[PDB]
Amino acid sequence: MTEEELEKGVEDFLVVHGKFVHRLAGIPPNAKFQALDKYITNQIVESDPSKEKEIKKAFGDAAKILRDALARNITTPEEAQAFLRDLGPWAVDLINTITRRYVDVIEKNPEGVAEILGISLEEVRELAEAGRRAIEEGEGASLGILRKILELEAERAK
Numbered sequence: 040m041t042e043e044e045l046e047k048g049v050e051d052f053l054v055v056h057g058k059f060v061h062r063l064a065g066i067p068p069n070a071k072f073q074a075l076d077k078y079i080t081n082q083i084v085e086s087d088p089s090k091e092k093e094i095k096k097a098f099g100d101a102a103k104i105l106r107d108a109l110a111r112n113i114t115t116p117e118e119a120q121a122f123l124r125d126l127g128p129w130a131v132d133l134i135n136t137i138t139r140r141y142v143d144v145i146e147k148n149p150e151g152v153a154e155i156l157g158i159s160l161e162e163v164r165e166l167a168e169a170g171r172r173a174i175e176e177g178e179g180a181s182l183g184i185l186r187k188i189l190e191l192e193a194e195r196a197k
Contacts, residue, residue, distance in 0.1 A: 040099075045092060048099025049084065053077055055105040060181050062109070063116055064189075071156055071192065072185050078155045082144040083137070101137060104130055116178035134179075141180045142170040162191050 040048075057073050084094050104126065113119050123130045145152055145167040152163045166187050173183025 040092070040096065045095035045099065048102055049080060049095055051102040052098040052105070053080060055102055055109055056080075056181070059105045059109055059119075060179075060185055062114060063119065063178075063182050064185050065114075066189065069185065069188065069192075072188055074155050075152065075184070075188070076181070078151065079141055079144045082148065082151075083140045086140070086144070097133060097137065100133060104134070116176075116182060119179075120177060138174060138180045141184070142167055142174070145170065145184075156188070156191075158191055158195070165191070 053073075053076060057068065057076055060072070060076075061068055080098065084091060084098070087094065104123070108119060108122055111122070113122055120131075123134055145163065149160050149163040149167075152158075152166065153160055156163075156166075158166075166184055169183045169187035170180035173186075174180050176183075
């Protein structure tokens with residue numbers, strides 16, 4: 040696949056990934072998570088220049104997976120995980136890899152997340168911590184990150 044085709048897959052990922060995570064959280068779309076989602080996805084792509092086409096291809100694959108799940112009655116992480124196991128272990132491992140990278144990006148560049156989200160470095164630490172817990176619970180890092188963003192956003196209206 041060309042660079043243009045790989046880029047359109049990453050663009051498709053950002054659209055369906057934001058819609059699907061917000062569905063699992065049960066809230067209307069959040070502007071701050073969308074900017075974080077785009078920031079993190081690009082950092083994952085640029086993380087390894089040697090595997091750039093591979094990581095881009097993985098995001099295009101996840102876009103087709105999440106697009107299928109969006110058209111089906113899947114509203115909880117438990118239903119999402121059972122949907123991935125029916126696709127096969129390849130889809131479970133692909134989503135997990137993406138999920139583990141998501142937290143890594145946060146921890147490796149805490150200031151960039153603090154600038155994008157307009158929060159403190161300690162609140163970024165809470166964001167990565169909340170992403171580690173959600174992986175342990177088997178509900179994805181981005182869902183636990185979104186839930187913590189809503190809390191920080193609600194707290195910071197003080």
